[PDB]
Amino acid sequence: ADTFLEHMCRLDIDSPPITARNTGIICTIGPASRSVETLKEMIKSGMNVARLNFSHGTHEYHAETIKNVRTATESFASDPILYRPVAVALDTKGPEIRTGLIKGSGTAEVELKKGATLKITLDNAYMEKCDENILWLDYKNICKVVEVGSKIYVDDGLISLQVKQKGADFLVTEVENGGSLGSKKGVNLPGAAVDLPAVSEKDIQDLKFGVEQDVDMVFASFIRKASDVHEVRKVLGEKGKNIKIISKIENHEGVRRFDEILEASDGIMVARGDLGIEIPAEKVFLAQKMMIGRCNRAGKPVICATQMLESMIKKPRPTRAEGSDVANAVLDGADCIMLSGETAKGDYPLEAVRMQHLIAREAEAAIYHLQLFEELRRLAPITSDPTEATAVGAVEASFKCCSGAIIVLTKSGRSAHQVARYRPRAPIIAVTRNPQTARQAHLYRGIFPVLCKDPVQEAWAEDVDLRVNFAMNVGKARGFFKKGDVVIVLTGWRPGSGFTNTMRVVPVP
Amino acid sequence: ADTFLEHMCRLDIDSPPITARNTGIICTIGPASRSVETLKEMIKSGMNVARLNFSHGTHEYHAETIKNVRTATESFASDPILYRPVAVALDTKGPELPAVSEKDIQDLKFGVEQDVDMVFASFIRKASDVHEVRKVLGEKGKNIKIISKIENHEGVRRFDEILEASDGIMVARGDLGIEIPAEKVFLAQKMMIGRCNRAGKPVICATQMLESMIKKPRPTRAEGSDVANAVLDGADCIMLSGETAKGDYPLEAVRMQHLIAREAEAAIYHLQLFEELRRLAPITSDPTEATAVGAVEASFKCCSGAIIVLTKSGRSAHQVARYRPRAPIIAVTRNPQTARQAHLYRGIFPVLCKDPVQEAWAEDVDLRVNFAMNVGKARGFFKKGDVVIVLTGWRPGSGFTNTMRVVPVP
Amino acid sequence: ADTFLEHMCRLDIDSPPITARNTGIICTIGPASRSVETLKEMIKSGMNVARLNFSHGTHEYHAETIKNVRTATESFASDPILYRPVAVALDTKGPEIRTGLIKGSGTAEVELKKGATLKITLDNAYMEKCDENILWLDYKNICKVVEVGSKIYVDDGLISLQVKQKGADFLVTEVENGGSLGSKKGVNLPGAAVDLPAVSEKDIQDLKFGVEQDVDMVFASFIRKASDVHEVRKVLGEKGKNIKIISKIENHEGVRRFDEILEASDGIMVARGDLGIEIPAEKVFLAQKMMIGRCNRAGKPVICATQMLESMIKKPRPTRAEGSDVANAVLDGADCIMLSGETAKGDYPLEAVRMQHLIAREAEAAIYHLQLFEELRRLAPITSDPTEATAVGAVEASFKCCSGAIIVLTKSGRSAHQVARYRPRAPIIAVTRNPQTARQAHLYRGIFPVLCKDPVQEAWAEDVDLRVNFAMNVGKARGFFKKGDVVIVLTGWRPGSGFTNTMRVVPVP
Amino acid sequence: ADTFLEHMCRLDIDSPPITARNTGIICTIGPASRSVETLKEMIKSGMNVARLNFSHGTHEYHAETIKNVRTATESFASDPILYRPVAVALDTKGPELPAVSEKDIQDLKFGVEQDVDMVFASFIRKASDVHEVRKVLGEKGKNIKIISKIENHEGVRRFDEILEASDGIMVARGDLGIEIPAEKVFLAQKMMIGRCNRAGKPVICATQMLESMIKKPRPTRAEGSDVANAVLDGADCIMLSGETAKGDYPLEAVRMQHLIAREAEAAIYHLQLFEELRRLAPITSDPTEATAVGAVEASFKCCSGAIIVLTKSGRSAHQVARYRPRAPIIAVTRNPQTARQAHLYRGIFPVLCKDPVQEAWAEDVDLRVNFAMNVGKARGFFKKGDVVIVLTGWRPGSGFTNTMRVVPVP
Ligand SMILES: N[C@@H](Cc1c[nH]c2ccccc12)C(=O)O
Ligand SMILES: N[C@@H](Cc1c[nH]c2ccccc12)C(=O)O
Ligand SMILES: N[C@@H](Cc1c[nH]c2ccccc12)C(=O)O
Ligand SMILES: N[C@@H](Cc1c[nH]c2ccccc12)C(=O)O
Ligand SMILES: [K+]
Ligand SMILES: [K+]
Ligand SMILES: [K+]
Ligand SMILES: [K+]
């Protein structure tokens, strides 16, 4: 395919999906995916990062989830060629409006009827007496920020309401969109100024527990401005300074102030459904393409979250439209896809992981790599910093000497990230001794991390050759290349080296 | 935007949708959209082609629907600068087997009788299926366009023969979604749209566009993305089904489909589409193709506001559209069927010249060009002092549209 | 040849010069080429412009030369398909330092001996008494501009001298380079500021005679600055306002101030030998490539003059090095080559014209056209002037629909020149009714002018079709194309049209 | 200069010749240039290779010439930063018939005995002529480079086989000028130089360069143009004959040949030479070629002051030069024959490391790199804070030069 149009006209749907998957998979662990035996099966089927939603459960609960994730992860360590690192991600509650419990016995489900009437109250007598008439919620200051004629959304926006009359505690609304109101659901107020903090007293505890439990990354919720990110940084502090902060863009202020949030964060998560409420639905696809685009250019990773395969909560296979939606998010240029209820609580957590792999595998057929790189090279600011210079040449060479891989010997990952910024077709095999580095690597597109566990041989160049040989074995075993192919190898020069400034064209023996 | 990535990083969601819409809109007429007053409002809000689903209703029923469509369409004819052609499309029942059922043979003959512009032929499996539809339409309906619908696996596998036999293609995503693995349909769509762009035949995306607007006044986030990605994939038209046929908000469905298709043009990166299509084009020295290329080429350089094509059958205007200019292609035609059929192509804006013919050839030409100049000015496409490209024949009755002319807007 | 290097590696010296010649030939008429029968044979063999050197001869003499040129030219008019226009060029004397006559009877030749002594004097007693001791010359102010240790050159620089002592009239010099000093020869003063005017009392007469005789172009000598060109323009004045001024660059000031001279002139002539004296020899080749380059970009024509085939004054065939020198001047991007003594006075004027055609024919094999055009298009300032827009598209189309020609219907030539600026491979057939336009066309590279003599039909489009058909006949007859080929045709739209804004792809009937 | 035409329109003749000379200079030693004191002055002024014409003189005569060349050459060795290698070239009599006359067999064996770097083999007609010269030089002189001289028509016709058999080519313009039509020789020259650039073997231009300097201290305008166009054509070295061998101004001939070749580099447009040579290169994934490409590619981007190649045989430094970087190629070698032979290639600046080997491989490497850094700084090629590219092997005894390293100048 010398042209993008010819790359589309070749697309044969009957020939098998030969290209391997190249984007991270993030699964939300919960009730249906929390056992060691399941986690094992999800790790095999492609889970790369375990997401823990601290909107629910106690610290005790999550500690066990984390312990199970690692138990399952390390079950495969007895073969260091096929062992895959799995990361752990702490996802903050944030500023969150939630409803109360549904009243009485039986099913926790009231049918909110289209056009009907609904009183929103702050009277804690109704705290667990939610029904068709009255609805409690936890935002105490709600009557000050919200006005007459304002929209209110409930349960990832399934239900919508319009404020008809205000009060001290009561707010009288008319139910515009119907649905089944469940217990304790999430409540958005588009174009309200929610006076809640960036880091609640709870979030401060949850983040300290994150540091304690040695998490790899924080998914910081309802990020509105740069100073919100810096408050998350401070709480993680000195001890958790190498934990990656992914800011979640969930509202309008988020999108408007995006550039400052990106420059302050380690990466970005685009919550499409939350935006879909706070912004006009017809415009979210541009928001997604803009944010993913800017992140590709800045070389920070970006995740697509919400509304991926939600039909697999109840079904063993997704819809046509969900498959298209996910795939276009991969082509847009996302680094990872994130499953939520699909894996957390759904009836088919294992099949959700396998389809997310299937879809992300197919999308790579549609990706036209040479354009992504040439554009990213031309927009790159012309530094003669040796590492960036070498990363470019490595990718450039990866297309020419038809390369099967780019092998990066990297301690912190930084070098492997600088190569990935430029979007090579070839897999980037990041060889690291630091296991956190190996775990964090999954956030980047096309990095395949491996963990070298033999400790260091005195002779520098031998240590290097041993690690390269490890990556050669892994690659051969993964099908990435076979004897007679050629790979690129980035290293330092000498053992104290500041730069990864050494490019080396190596035939696979 | 010198790069495609920089074209995405510029995308400001707060600034209004300044670029005008460039892809056809096809609406399915039925119970909720069948009155003249509604049709009127849908035509204003952007309907370009009326689709009649002959899976349901009697011939008598549809005859009235068609008559209402035309009544509404012609309400605007009293201003020939702002009059917009509206097309009629007959959509077969199909096998539910042979390619043309005893019913379909009747329905197609009724199509010819009613002077439809295009047939959406269902469950097209192979090339010989298309040719059977052609034969039934026969001599009298020989200028009716056949859009083959790809609805099953055999359809996708044998696509190249179906495309080479058809006037255009419709990709029914939901039908494929059943017959094919769900995870693969998006590739099918990108392949089929791709091949059609290259062959220069039009392609339509149908089913599962804004189906939530059957009951709701606004679509979902995911529907909006789905439609928009179909436009970027490179579709020429989008087709609404239940949204407009029977739903509670037929008029708002048309307006959103316009809104979405308007926003998608911001995301389109035009210079790449053209340069790729030029490089893949087989080096003919057929004068019309040679001129169509140069016209598009010039449309980028002399920052052109339009390409005006004087075309009787449309063929010339289609050859320009194959090459995907950013500029609007104003197809000026005296044939009203040509003006109606034009909507199938992306970025063709057809206009209908009703002034009769002046004896002096070059005067007739200048009068038509001046008509397009007026329409363009009035539509905001360009203003005085801009430059447009003008394709014409050379001499009367000419076989080629082989005359390119760089004209300042007066 | 997709690359320029592959265009060189293809160059087969055994296969004949298949490509037709595409650059103008200018011959200097004089003693050996002044008869009608010779001029006839030179016109057949390829002369396109007759050059008359007004450094010598009276007005009466030249009037006859001009009359002979036209007699010979029009001999071929009895077939308007094969008739070729021939232009006439008046070449000014300029500010000129010259020596006196050699003393006495007999041989007009004194042997200036290497290292010897030579007095330069202004005493008109010695005006026709030049010898080994004393040498008269015509520059009265020579003692003011020249200093002790200064170089002085004589007779196209064959002889060189160094100033040892100054005086009022006398200047005592030491003869550095030897040779045979003849009568009245040319005397350069490198890095002197020669205080002479731009248009001498003589040049004013010669230019008025030019207008009188209906010349097509003036080759203005010793052009130093823009204001010198404008003085030549004023003298030619209203009546001779369509006579083209070619400025000759002959000295250092010329090269330094080139951009203003080019912007003021209709075209440029690069006198390599004259520069070779005023400038360091090793730098002239860069000057030539710069000046030719700038002229190609400005779209004004440029001529290479002096030191082409000078060995053919005495010999029937040139040297290897002369052939290379000429050919590289064509590849540099010159529009015309100019022969001097070779044709003016030499023993083989006819063979000099035929070799100059042979060489210029071979050079077109080495020319790589697609690069010239693509570069010239990218550097062209993005006007939306309809004529430039159409000229570009015409050339663009000339490569694609493998075109045999670009036919331009042009009254003044301007349209045909705008096409030629962009360097198509295809011949540009300029069809004009103005015979001066047809003559002046030869200054441009790749314009093949033809003169339509059928008078005008009232119907515009018929007139147009008749002219197009004339060019079709000429092209067929010249071998440029045959039936079934495709050509491009530029015209106006309507008879009052300002622009040549109509491009038309026409199969050859 | 983004375009070649803009590279010509910039050419300022008043600003000094800032770019350094980049093509080898070969001088013919003889009566007027045979003394140690002269040779010294020619080496300073830029002689890179001494040519000995075995058409005349006895073996005894030449032995002394060679001994004088080396005496003069090594006078500068007392500063290994500024020491420049000088090569010796044996130029056969040839047939004046078989390819190797009984004389030539003796002269070539004497060449091997005297440790010459290259043979200029005369009147080469076909490939089998080259192989006979190879056999005579044999095992002991197997690393002596054979430059075939093209002097006649058979030579030009059969050129491709001669090039594929030879180490390099010499184009004798005057000899061709007799055997071929004068008007065609310039094409022959451009063809042969072109093919040699593409094959990556070196090519020399000989005869009719500055012949007027036999008697005069300065050349003609036309000689200067002739030489300069030979450099732009793409020659690697220029060769002076009588100018330096017997003429009255041998030293000034060398200085002008430097002056001209210095000016020609202003006119050279490098980015085109490289991109063309890369696109025509057969896409091997042999690690050395892969790295040579990337090195040149990087040399334009990280605006590099040099490409430093640690090379034992030169082969690596030659593979970089094939691709025509603007940057100087500093070939660092311990083999003095390698350093001498390097001058045949365009843009290689060889240096001779005389410090012996440190046991630690990477230290040895760093010491050589540091030597080239010192040389470059001292030659003005770059200063502290610039960035250079460094090619090396990976372990000791490595077969590939497969290690590219972007290094700031300390
Ligand atoms: N980062 C993920 C996905 C991935 C990137 N590149 C790959 C190459 C092969 C397989 C998977 C991948 C992983 O390591 O699994
Ligand atoms: N064919 C459609 C869409 C379209 C094409 N080109 C356009 C230019 C402007 C506006 C709309 C269009 C129409 O005429 O409406
Ligand atoms: N104008 C010149 C040179 C020329 C340009 N294009 C040509 C094509 C053919 C012959 C000559 C030419 C001539 O007529 O002689
Ligand atoms: N090879 C020659 C010419 C040369 C190539 N690159 C150079 C850089 C600088 C000076 C000279 C050169 C030398 O070393 O002298
Ligand atoms: K959360
Ligand atoms: K149907
Ligand atoms: K003169
Ligand atoms: K010899």
Side-chain angles (χ1 to χ4, degrees), chain C residues 435-448:
Chain C
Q436 197 178 52
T437 297
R439 284 190 293 283
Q440 290 175 2
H442 290 301
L443 285 161
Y444 294 80
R445 179 216 159 74
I447 299 190
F448 184 91

Side-chain angles (χ1 to χ4, degrees), chain C residues 20-25 46-48 84-85 335 357 426-428 441-449 478 480:
Chain C
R21 187 248 298 181
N22 225 218
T23 38
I25 293 173
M47 181 170 63
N48 290 114
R84 305 301 311 128
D335 293 278
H357 176 99
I428 301 157
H442 290 301
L443 285 161
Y444 294 80
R445 179 216 159 74
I447 299 190
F448 184 91
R478 290 290 169 206
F480 299 175

Side-chain angles (χ1 to χ4, degrees), chain C residues 468-484:
Chain C
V468 169
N469 200 257
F470 177 53
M472 292 289 197
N473 289 319
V474 170
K476 281 229 220 78
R478 290 290 169 206
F480 299 175
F481 47 74
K482 53 223 122 22
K483 178 206 306 198

Side-chain angles (χ1 to χ4, degrees), chain B residues 374-391:
Chain B
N374 289 320
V375 171
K377 281 227 220 61
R379 290 290 169 205
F381 299 175
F382 46 74
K383 54 140 215 310
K384 178 170 183 213
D386 295 14
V387 175
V388 306
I389 310 301
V390 167
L391 309 193

Side-chain angles (χ1 to χ4, degrees), chain B residues 146-224:
Chain B
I146 300 172
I147 308 308
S148 298
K149 292 166 71 182
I150 307 309
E151 294 185 302
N152 59 322
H153 194 204
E154 167 152 52
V156 180
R157 202 168 52 254
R158 287 195 181 224
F159 183 79
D160 279 332
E161 55 168 289
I162 292 161
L163 176 55
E164 278 149 15
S166 312
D167 293 291
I169 295 296
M170 184 184 278
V171 166
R173 288 100 53 77
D175 291 76
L176 293 170
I178 300 156
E179 266 277 21
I180 281 173
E183 80 272 13
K184 286 179 180 284
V185 176
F186 87 100
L187 282 179
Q189 176 174 315
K190 286 174 202 289
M191 177 257 251
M192 289 186 281
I193 290 171
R195 287 190 193 171
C196 289
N197 292 180
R198 184 182 51 180
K201 298 187 174 158
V203 68
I204 298 165
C205 277
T207 79
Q208 314 199 330
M209 305 303 310
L210 306 172
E211 305 292 333
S212 82
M213 298 192 64
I214 291 174
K215 303 297 172 203
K216 286 80 226 309
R218 274 187 66 86
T220 66
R221 190 280 315 156
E223 283 170 339

Side-chain angles (χ1 to χ4, degrees), chain B residues 85-143:
Chain B
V86 181
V88 171
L90 193 150
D91 192 305
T92 70
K93 186 144 133 46
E96 297 178 342
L97 289 177
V100 202
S101 50
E102 221 177 36
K103 182 159 202 296
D104 292 334
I105 293 164
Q106 255 112 55
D107 291 347
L108 288 170
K109 176 205 192 223
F110 178 76
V112 178
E113 278 177 42
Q114 295 288 320
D115 195 8
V116 302
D117 307 298
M118 59 193 65
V119 169
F120 297 167
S122 310
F123 222 76
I124 294 300
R125 271 164 286 106
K126 42 189 193 298
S128 60
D129 287 1
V130 175
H131 293 288
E132 284 174 61
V133 174
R134 190 83 64 183
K135 188 163 193 130
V136 169
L137 292 174
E139 168 56 32
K140 185 151 155 276
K142 84 203 181 196
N143 299 139

Side-chain angles (χ1 to χ4, degrees), chain C residues 17-25 45 272 307-312 316-331 337 339 342 351-367 445, chain D residues 181-187 190:
Chain C
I18 62 193
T19 187
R21 187 248 298 181
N22 225 218
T23 38
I25 293 173
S45 294
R272 289 99 54 77
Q307 314 202 332
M308 300 301 200
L309 307 171
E310 303 293 333
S311 81
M312 298 191 65
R317 281 197 65 84
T319 67
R320 188 281 315 156
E322 282 171 338
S324 186
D325 184 47
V326 173
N328 282 333
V330 174
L331 311 187
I337 299 299
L339 312 173
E342 301 93 320
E351 289 85 351
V353 177
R354 291 164 181 187
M355 288 296 319
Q356 175 48 48
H357 176 99
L358 250 281
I359 293 161
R361 226 194 139 81
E362 295 266 2
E364 306 292 323
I367 291 168
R445 179 216 159 74
Chain D
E183 79 272 15
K184 289 204 214 293
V185 176
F186 87 100
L187 286 168
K190 286 174 201 290

